[PDB]
Amino acid sequence: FHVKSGLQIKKNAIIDDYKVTSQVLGLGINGKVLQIFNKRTQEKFALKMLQDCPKARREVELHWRASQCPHIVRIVDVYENLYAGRKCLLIVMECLDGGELFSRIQDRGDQAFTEREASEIMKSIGEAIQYLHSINIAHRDVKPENLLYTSKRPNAILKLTDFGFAKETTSGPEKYDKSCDMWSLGVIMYILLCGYPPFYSNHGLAISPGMKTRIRMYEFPNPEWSEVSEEVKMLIRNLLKTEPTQRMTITEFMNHPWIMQSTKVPQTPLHTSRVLKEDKERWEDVKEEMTSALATMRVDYEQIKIKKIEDASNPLLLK
Ligand SMILES: [Hg+2]
Ligand SMILES: [Hg+2]
Ligand SMILES: [Hg+2]
Ligand SMILES: [Hg+2]
Ligand SMILES: [Hg+2]
Ligand SMILES: [Hg+2]
């Protein structure tokens, strides 16, 4: 391929390069993307603040090395500065003002979301994951808050952000990690096709979706209503959720007719806009629930650290 420059965390102050309002800087302590403007170009730009440290710097290394895909937001500058008393890892990103994916769909006069758009979109998102996954990165937080449009007007591009759980799928960790992305793709494509999450149960114990991956007990909408969703559209959204060992591969997904020969799939108008519009709250409810589902599925590692203190050989000494 093409050797590209390594990441170099600029150490100088950030405010002599971008107009961090040093006011506005304040709302960014919990990690909410704020806005800055480059000084000698006065350009756009986003800023996400993180507590500097290995585990914040690992993910920023990760996202940095995946700026490449046109389907991944672009990080333009990384700064390691001293803000207040702490040590801040300030990451400047290309700004995406086009919208949050479902926040676009949700609001349509009546344009109506059509299955082929549902497919075009799934190739987009599947593009990103197919990128990330070939360079051994597992994103593991692919959810609606993280899929944003670039511009606003037409021709807009869809890219994923927030790599704060992104991990290196390389050493069961190949499969398991990777599969939190496949599951998310099964969960997004179902809400995209129905307007509802695959979080309904009629059978037994209404085990939650997160826990459902550690097993126990997914059902689809009334065959007639909006379940107009092809039985080929049903198998793929089902293969993408089974978590066991017979889990799908992003190549498998991308090697799918519906995916690959997309923009040829029928333009079956769908109920997605209506549902998300009709209860803006149960949509917020759905969102929390996928966040949660994700947090309960992710498995992470950690080193063992034992405390040490000196052995008291003679409690009567000068010590
Ligand atoms: Hg940290
Ligand atoms: Hg790419
Ligand atoms: Hg910070
Ligand atoms: Hg922005
Ligand atoms: Hg994307
Ligand atoms: Hg998983």
Domain parsing of the chain, residue ranges? 14-95, 96-299
CATH code linked to domain 96-299: 1.10.510.10
Question: Long-range contacts for 234-240 (Cβ within 8 Å, ≥24 apart)?
Answer: 236/189, 237/186, 237/189, 237/190, 237/193, 237/198, 238/186, 240/182, 240/183, 240/185, 240/186, 240/189
CB distance 267 to 114 below 8 Å? yes
Q: Which listed ligand is nearest to 169 at the C-alpha?
A: 6
Please, where are the H alpha helices in 80-174? 101-105, 115-134
Reported CATH class of domain 14-95 = alpha beta
Distance 114 CA to ligand 1 centre (A): 42
CA-to-CA separations, 3 to 74, 75, 114, in angstroms, rounded: 18, 18, 41
Non-local CB neighbours of 258 within 8 Å, separated by 6+ positions: 119, 122, 230, 232, 233, 236, 265
* Residue written as token pair 């599947």: 126
Distance 272 CA to ligand 6 centre (A): 26
What single-letter amino acid sits at 91?
I
DSSP letter at 91 equals E
CB crowding 163-186: b at 16 or more within 10 Å, else e: bbbbbebeeeeeebbbbbbbbbbb
Helix (H, G, I), strand (E, B) or coil at 120: helix
The reply to whether 31 sits in an annotated binding site is yes
Which residues are part of the catalytic machinery? 141
- Give the integer Cα–Cα distance in Å for 235 and 237: 6
- Give the integer Cα–Cα distance in Å for 233 and 259: 10
The reply to whether 167 sits in an annotated binding site is no
Q: Which listed ligand is nearest to 50 at the C-alpha?
A: 3
- Give the integer Cα–Cα distance in Å for 172 and 293: 19
Non-local CB neighbours of 311 within 8 Å, separated by 6+ positions: none
The reply to whether 48 sits in an annotated binding site is yes
Distance 185 CA to ligand 5 centre (A): 11
CA neighbours closer than 13 Å in the CB half-sphere of residue 167: 20
- Give the integer Cα–Cα distance in Å for 248 and 239: 6
The reply to whether 47 sits in an annotated binding site is no
Phi, psi of 103 (to 5 degrees): -75, -10
- Give the integer Cα–Cα distance in Å for 9 and 53: 13
Distance 50 CA to ligand 1 centre (A): 8
